[PDB]
Design a protein around this ligand. Sequence first.
Ligand SMILES: Nc1ccn([C@@H]2O[C@H](COP(=O)(O)OP(=O)(O)OP(=O)(O)O)[C@@H](O)[C@H]2O)c(=O)n1
Ligand SMILES: Nc1ccn([C@@H]2O[C@H](COP(=O)(O)OP(=O)(O)OP(=O)(O)O)[C@@H](O)[C@H]2O)c(=O)n1
Ligand SMILES: [Mg+2]
Ligand SMILES: [Mg+2]
Ligand SMILES: [Mg+2]
Lengths: 538, 538, 537
Amino acid sequence: MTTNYIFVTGGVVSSLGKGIAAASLAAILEARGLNVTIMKLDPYINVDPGTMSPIQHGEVFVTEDGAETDLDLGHYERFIRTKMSRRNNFTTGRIYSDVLRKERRGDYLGATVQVIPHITNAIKERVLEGGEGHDVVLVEIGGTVGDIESLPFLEAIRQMAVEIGREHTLFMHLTLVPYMAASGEVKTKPTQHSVKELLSIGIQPDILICRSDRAVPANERAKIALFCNVPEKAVISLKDVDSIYKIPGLLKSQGLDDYICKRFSLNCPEANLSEWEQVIFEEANPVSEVTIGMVGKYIELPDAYKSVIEALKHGGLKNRVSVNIKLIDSQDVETRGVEILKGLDAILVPGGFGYRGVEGMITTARFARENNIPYLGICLGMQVALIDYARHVANMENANSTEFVPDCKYPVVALITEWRDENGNVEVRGTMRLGAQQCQLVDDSLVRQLYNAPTIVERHRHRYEVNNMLLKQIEDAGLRVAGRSGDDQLVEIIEVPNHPWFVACQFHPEFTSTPRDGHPLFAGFVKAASEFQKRQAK
Amino acid sequence: MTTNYIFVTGGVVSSLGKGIAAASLAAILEARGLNVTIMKLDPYINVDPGTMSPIQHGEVFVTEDGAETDLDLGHYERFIRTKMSRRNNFTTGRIYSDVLRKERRGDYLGATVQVIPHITNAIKERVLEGGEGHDVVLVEIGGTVGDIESLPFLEAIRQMAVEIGREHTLFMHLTLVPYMAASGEVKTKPTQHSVKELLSIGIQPDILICRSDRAVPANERAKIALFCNVPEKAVISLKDVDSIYKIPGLLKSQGLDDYICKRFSLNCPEANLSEWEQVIFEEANPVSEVTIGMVGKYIELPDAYKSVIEALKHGGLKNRVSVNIKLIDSQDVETRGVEILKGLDAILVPGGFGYRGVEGMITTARFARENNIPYLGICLGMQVALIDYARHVANMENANSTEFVPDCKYPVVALITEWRDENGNVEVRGTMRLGAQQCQLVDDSLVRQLYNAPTIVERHRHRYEVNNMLLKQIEDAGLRVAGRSGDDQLVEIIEVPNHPWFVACQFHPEFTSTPRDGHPLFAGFVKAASEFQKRQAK
Amino acid sequence: MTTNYIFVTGGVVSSLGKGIAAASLAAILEARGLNVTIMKLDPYINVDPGTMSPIQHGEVFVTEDGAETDLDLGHYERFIRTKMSRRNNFTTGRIYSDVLRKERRGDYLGATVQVIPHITNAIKERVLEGGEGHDVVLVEIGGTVGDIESLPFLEAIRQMAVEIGREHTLFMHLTLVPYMAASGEVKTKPTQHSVKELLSIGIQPDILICRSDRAVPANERAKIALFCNVPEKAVISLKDVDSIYKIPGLLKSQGLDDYICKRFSLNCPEANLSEWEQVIFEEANPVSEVTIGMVGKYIELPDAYKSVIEALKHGGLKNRVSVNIKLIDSQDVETRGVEILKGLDAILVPGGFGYRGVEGMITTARFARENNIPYLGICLGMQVALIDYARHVANMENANSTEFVPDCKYPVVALITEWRDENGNVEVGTMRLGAQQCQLVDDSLVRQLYNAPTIVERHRHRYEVNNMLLKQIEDAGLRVAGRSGDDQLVEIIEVPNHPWFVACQFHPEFTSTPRDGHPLFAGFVKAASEFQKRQAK
Ligand SMILES: Nc1ccn([C@@H]2O[C@H](COP(=O)(O)OP(=O)(O)OP(=O)(O)O)[C@@H](O)[C@H]2O)c(=O)n1
Ligand SMILES: Nc1ccn([C@@H]2O[C@H](COP(=O)(O)OP(=O)(O)OP(=O)(O)O)[C@@H](O)[C@H]2O)c(=O)n1
Ligand SMILES: [Mg+2]
Ligand SMILES: [Mg+2]
Ligand SMILES: [Mg+2]
């Protein structure tokens, strides 16, 4: 009945996969019947990732309650069925912002407000708030042990372990064990030094997860155990794998979940990883192959598109199609033309902001539409598909979004308060749309048969809407509105009927796709890519 | 022409006198003709000390531009003639508060805002802003090297020293060298360990200031030099002294200012410490002695009254009177009566907020008034002297301040917007008063002959004013308004004419008193205490 | 004429190439005309490497004065022309051994002997002994910064820097900058943490050498500079290279030696690396290839044969031949037979002690002799050749070495004090270490290859050719091609009716270098090449 905490930290270097390891561990525990959750503590000073460029730390993930969060919560939702919310991610900026607010308005009664206890107290309160009510709470600490920015998080969790007690708290520490071509050996020295660094902050790790480009052999594991006050059976090897869905099984085969349940006195049955075995099996046994081009403006950091790239792979799983994803710069389409779009079985244009690279995307949507190449557009990818149709079928020259050209004659995409027609008229009488919202699907649409329900729930993160005042003209010219939502009847999904498969939506369906359940939209997309590839195979 | 920086840090323990050592060093440099300033970096999270109880870190010092600052700026103003301002003190809370504000409003252009570089950049900008335009800038880092809360300050100044270069930056590190009765020796081990801690943050100290209850002998100084990469001549002993005015001379006699001017290539003449020698001489040669009772509500931490206690000593200097200051709890006067006020040659009631202990203060002002004991009241000490006169001479029963009893018939002290008379009437048609303000002194008043000018400038920190609507009645009953100010003609100074010396002011004169120039109000107070003591000596 | 010191340390992991990096930097400085030396400080407790197994330490390098030393001194002598000696290498064990001796003697006068100052004073005195009289002294500190075992070394050199002054000392620190496939980036965090560790011991590094499996780009070098109080030009990338002879040029092109000469106020000309450029060219342009089998008992750890394996590559540089070195366990020859020797163009049997695997080496000598396969035997490789010849030509059944079969009838190899004939008659420790002169026999293959009458080579061995049984072995064919000393001990034997069969008692691999080669190995590799061509057609 008492809540147990597993604090997950990293050492030596930052990019160890703390999130994926925590999520995989959570998936084993959940498969033992336990009520598990995960939360992410980010040391940066942004109050939240909303102000962050996608090229900085990757995509902004969006929870169903509308929070903007670190992309690690995407890994969490793809590995366990617990729903993430605002309380599963917070930053240092959020902590200080809250403490400064209490302080300025007098809540501390004339006390000197100090890093210890007031910042650490605020950290602990948020950890308990997101962990409260679960059997096991995995708490992932961003940063690298030994840096300035994570010390308040570390000191806070050190204090929690004392208060709660060691019957209900574990410290799990990841480190890099690098291979040296010199000695042909992996090296445990960095792990030794990192553990001493963690100890000097007051934290004795209980489990060591060793990352390496290969398995960490027994002798190296015993030497780590010897220098780190950790039992050998708690030194766990996590080599680089070709498929993260294998990671639950790798951790289970080394008894990591047994060790945790023993420390926590949890009596639950053996983990049933059948669902992960099934994903691995599907992935290893494709029947067919396709190449899908993803044309966007953030290609330089693929993590800008983490959840979309994963959604495409889940689409392939459901179809036994191996998906080759080709990242293509939308600005290269502007420079070099559609020469670089050839050889694709489908085209996907994902979300984005700013005008840079948008005209390449409009060009791309046009290419896909005129050549009957399956197309999926997401958010900005819908805007450019609407602009394309407006320019090149509805005969609305230079049609555009006010985000890009604020004073075009044909603002087919615009904020609601900006809506106007080609004569400047308006309707009689920032609003970021965030989180889950119901959408009504139109009878006899592609998407109504894919979702096989009259209403769906999907998540938004966008400001600019389809201008209803110019929509009827584009519809007359052949475009189908496939889904709407809200009192204002905002357009959510459009379709191009005279095409094998041409869909674009305003919401981000990639945030609800998982490898175990897939997603009906991406499954249909990849299936259409496969059918195209077989037609052109003649 | 280039600005030089001396970063002052402390190790081993916090209460080393970093402020007094920095101020004394500044006084030597200033006496060599240099344009010097000092600034204080506080690791706590309060945006500024305004919200801090006086019992936490001592008095809230107030600069002439109205800033609320750490009391260390009182030491700075008592040692150098440069004027302190808002830019000579800032906190971690101020740094984060500023960075969060730029971040939320988009000033960082989608970047991840990090401790390094964005917090440290903001620290450096403030250091340059307060140092810009001086020959030498002393930068005092609050906290103890090795704690979490000071690491951003330390990393920031490490980066400054690299950018500016070591021709213009010095690290001066204070440590404790404790005496062990066991070995009859002082111990350098803590200094060794603290320097390694500072080094592990990236900072090689250049000067070591050794605090101890006695001189640190040569052999111990050489051993510190040996383990700390510091030349012997830069290991400076600063024993506990009976008088901080000796500290400039102690530091000069060990060549510390020579060493600094050599590192900085400054060609200035030998320091002329005549003014400090004169203060020391006055202090060592009093003619007479007095006991002054200070009756207030914060007696448990004398630093609640730092600048007042110093002002009394400067008053004694100007008169060659040795002042014995007796801290008396105003709440003991409520419990035990005026039995504890006997044997005093003068009574001073200082500032404060809250009703707790105020009635003891009113009682005290009455005792001093009825027995012709010299009295000085400051801010709250003026309010209680007005209340006393209102109750016991003007026959305004239960007269009080709205701060304490919001609905009394006779609110003789109240916020301007609350002013009303005993019948509830008002005038036809939070405002904290902070900083320097002109005050007009009334002809033929005690204070007009003490200040010997028709207008003065003094500093305020208060909200509650003398109610003008009830003032004329108290004046008719004998009380003299000695000084006023502003358009609203607010009462600044009151006097009781039928008394040897009874003065109370609304502003804080203790913030402009120095040991070299004294202060005309306190000088008169202590002189009146001496005359009383000689009358009662019969 | 003031001696400058460069202290070389390593962080993050041990196997960074400290010795090779120091040796490569010393090569650049030597190519500017500077008088440079290098010395190695090892944290282990062995008084010296003489006791260590080659299977764990690597080979025992032997200097010309006869010290047994770390194999790093082999790299030193292959990069600069200064001769190493006992002064160039010492261990923690040697330091504690010296201090304990004075203490028990009474030299400290009843003081408490302490790590500081007495262990550190002892370390500093040995550094000054090795360094004095040179322009620049590179001082390699073994271990990894942050480990217990090298703290006394680090505290000693911190103190020296203060005493000597920073105008004449530099700290140069290697680190690992690992590449993460996750991010596609190399990572500077371990360098940041290692430098803080070095700072916390009291040492501010001046130069950071960044080891990685690829070049460390400028943004990462700039980030390292920013966090480590090191200027950007003093952050040097040293990627994994396919030939260590490229490393001097790689460091020169990043200005490393310019930086050092400035700090030390040395005005000397530009480094002329043309001899290293020639070595790089030769290695990159082999005209043919050979496979040479190295048949020994320590092949489990290749570094057991570090210098032999280098000498073979030098032999290939001189003949423009790519040498393919096949390590063959001599016990497999005992178990599986001589078929594991087929497809070799030459055969080499290197040094060793103890009997395990020796009968396999004896079988290998016979095979190479009975098949006219080029053979080169070194130390124990000479004994098995002599044994093979005694058994199967001179008809001395079970001929052996007293070291292996102490009471054999024909002890063709034995200690001098053990020499006896096959009837037990006799004539009316002794570890030979270091340089010794040898006299070459006229008309011998080796007199021709060495092209002089006398040579100097280095010994490390106890067991000699038994002169009382040798005249029998000569009459049966075997030619003595070289001899040393008063007792006329056999140094080189030869089988004349063979294309190329030489075995020697000294370790010629210790005097071979990439720039000058070695007459014996150049001839060996040339003979393998000619054999490989006759086999084709
Ligand atoms: N002493 C330091 C230095 C860096 N940081 C923080 O570390 C973060 C950078 O993280 P990371 O990318 O892991 O480190 P890098 O310095 O970029 O190093 P690397 O080359 O290994 O990525 C920044 O947010 C910065 O605030 C810190 O807290 N303490
Ligand atoms: N806290 C420690 C731990 C180990 N050692 C020393 O480190 C040496 C081992 O060096 P190395 O092989 O680099 O360390 P390993 O522990 O084997 O680590 P790795 O896996 O990286 O090889 C030993 O001689 C031992 O004395 C030390 O001095 N201080
Ligand atoms: Mg090892
Ligand atoms: Mg002592
Ligand atoms: Mg990075």
